[PDB]
Amino acid sequence: MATIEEIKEVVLKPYTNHRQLTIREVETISINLIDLLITKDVKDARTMKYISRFLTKQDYADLVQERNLVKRCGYPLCSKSQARVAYLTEYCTKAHFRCSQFYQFQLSDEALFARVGVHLDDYEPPSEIQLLE
Ligand SMILES: [Zn+2]
Numbered sequence: 001m002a003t004i005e006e007i008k009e010v011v012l013k014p015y016t017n018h019r020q021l022t023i024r025e026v027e028t029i030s031i032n033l034i035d036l037l038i039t040k041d042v043k044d045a046r047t048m049k050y051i052s053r054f055l056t057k058q059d060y061a062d063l064v065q066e067r068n069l070v071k072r073c074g075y076p077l078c079s080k081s082q083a084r085v086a087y088l089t090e091y092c093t094k095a096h097f098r099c100s101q102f103y104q105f106q107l108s109d110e111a112l113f114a115r116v117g118v119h120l121d122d123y124e125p126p127s128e129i130q131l132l133e
Contacts, residue, residue: 002040002076004050008121010036015119026113030059038066042076045131048103051076052129053118057107064090064100075100102132 008016011032015025033054042048055063064074071081073092077099080092091097106129108115117123 002036002042002047003044004047006040007033007036007047007051012119016121018119021113021119023113026119029054029119030112034059034063034066037063037076038070041072041079045077048077048131049129052103052107053115053123053125054112055107056112057104057109059112060104060107075103099132102130106130 011029015021015029018025021029033051037051042051063076067074067076068082068085068090071085072078073080073082073096074090075092075096078092078096082089083092087094087097091100106127108126112118
């Protein structure tokens with residue numbers, strides 16, 4: 001149900017013409033993004049690769065735990081719930097555990113605020129994020 005387009009309209013919209021953001025606005029983007037990905041699952045490989053530019057490894061760790069609190073598998077692409085509320089309290093299967101780890105291990109630790117132009121339609125990520133399978 002979550003898409004690049006939905007993220008651009010609901011999260012990024014106020015910021016689209018800003019040359020620069022304050023720490024404060026960058027903080028609003030995370031909070032709003034993270035919040036959308038609790039209410040919704042990610043539709044798309046395309047959309048997983050896109051959301052990577054907004055998450056640090058920690059942000060992703062919190063995303064998973066907030067998803068467990070809400071009875072969904074930690075891997076954002078998964079419409080199913082976890083297996084049982086070692087890693088099986090976080091994921092539906094072993095396979096989504098690895099998929100999740102595979103994803104996270106690519107996320108930068110560079111603070112969001114320091115990712116110049118990350119809010120722009122036009123931004124270029126340092127590498128293409130890979131999804132397991
Ligand atoms: Zn799952």
